[PDB]
Design a protein around this ligand. Structure first.
Ligand SMILES: *[C@@H]1O[C@H](CO)[C@@H](O)[C@H](O)[C@H]1NC(C)=O
Ligand code: NA
Lengths: 196, 125
């Protein structure tokens, strides 16, 4: 464990995932300075659960996972234990007993465009809610009624994904926010990601 | 089945006006942000306008204040009022549902967008 953990490729990526197809990166065999991130004035959300951020430099884990995606600013509240709404329900679900940190910052300057950027998607329809940390990238037509759809969109036959419309003069609740979720995994197995 | 029913184009003298009407079939104007592209001579695509969810509007700099987008939810219709037309406005105008939505994942002018056949507009000297 001499390498510095490769967080820059996650936090500084040019393009982020759509939330329905959220990205996961395993972090291992490296030294992470969590305090430097935490004492970054770069984040408007930095919320930890089951761990102290001011103590994370003291701890070793087996693996760390860094999940990332874009959502609306008024949806960042959903990326926490115990939440409901279309993001928690059908896109990205934390467990009630989550151990980890939720990090977010406004990305209007990168992710909005004049005329609207519609390349970021979310799942609007699903027969049931996601379980914690589930990922669903399927695109089957959602049968909202009792008539079958036969692969054709129409009345009560919905393609299940929807674009966000991010344009620069949106109010801040409708602006894009980049999110990184750090989860901390301790197995009965060596422990490869340490603080300094 | 999903489609756009488009009307109101054709031929007009410079300085005249037209009004385009666009009515989705199999979905509604509430489902996505509505707008128009236009395909100018040379297969030159340009975003003309969009009515965003929040009620704000985008216009291309060359059409601002001459063209007005409006929407009547009860009629499931979006409108493009085209005043004081100019020869350089000549194009095939395409109503769009911007982005991905209940009508599917489609493309127009290189981006996510659901279009249909469009309406030619020809502005003479
Ligand atoms: C991302 O880039 C900024 C700008 O140079 C840098 O200061 C920051 O530390 C980077 N973030 C991470 C996680 O390395
Ligand atoms: Na709309």
């Amino acid at each position: 464990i001499t390498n510095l953990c490769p967080f820059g490729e996650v936090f500084n990526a040019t393009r982020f995932a759509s939330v329905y197809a959220w990205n996961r990166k395993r972090i291992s065999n490296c030294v992470a300075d969590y305090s430097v991130l935490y004492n970054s004035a770069s984040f408007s959300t930095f919320k930890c659960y089951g761990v102290s951020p001011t103590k994370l430099n003291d701890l070793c884990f087996t693996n760390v996972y860094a999940d990332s995606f874009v959502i609306r600013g008024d949806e960042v509240r959903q990326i926490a234990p115990g939440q409901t709404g279309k993001i928690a329900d059908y896109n990205y679900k934390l467990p009630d007993d989550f151990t980890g940190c939720v990090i977010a910052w406004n990305s209007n300057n990168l992710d909005s465009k004049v005329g609207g950027n519609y390349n970021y998607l979310y799942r609007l329809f699903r027969k049931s809610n996601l379980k914690p940390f589930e990922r669903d990238i399927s695109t089957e037509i959602y049968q909202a009624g009792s008539t079958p759809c036969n692969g054709v969109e129409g009345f009560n036959c919905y393609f299940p994904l929807q674009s966000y419309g991010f344009q620069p003069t949106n109010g801040v609740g409708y602006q894009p926010y980049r999110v990184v979720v750090l989860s901390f995994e301790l197995l009965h197995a060596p422990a490869t990601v340490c603080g300094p | 089945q999903v489609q756009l029913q488009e009307s109101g184009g054709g031929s007009v003298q410079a300085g005249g006006s037209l009004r385009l009407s666009c009515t989705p079939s199999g979905f509604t104007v509430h489902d996505s942000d509505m707008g128009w592209y236009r395909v100018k001579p040379g297969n030159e695509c340009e975003l003309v306008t969009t009515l965003f969810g929040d009620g704000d509007t985008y216009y291309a700099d060359s059409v601002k204040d001459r063209f007005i987008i409006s929407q009547d939810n009860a009629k499931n219709t979006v409108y493009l009022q085209m005043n004081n037309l100019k020869p350089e406005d000549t194009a095939k105008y395409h109503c769009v549902a911007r982005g991905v939505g209940v009508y599917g994942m489609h493309w127009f002018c290189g981006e996510y967008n659901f279009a249909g056949q469009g309406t030619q507009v020809t502005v003479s000297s």
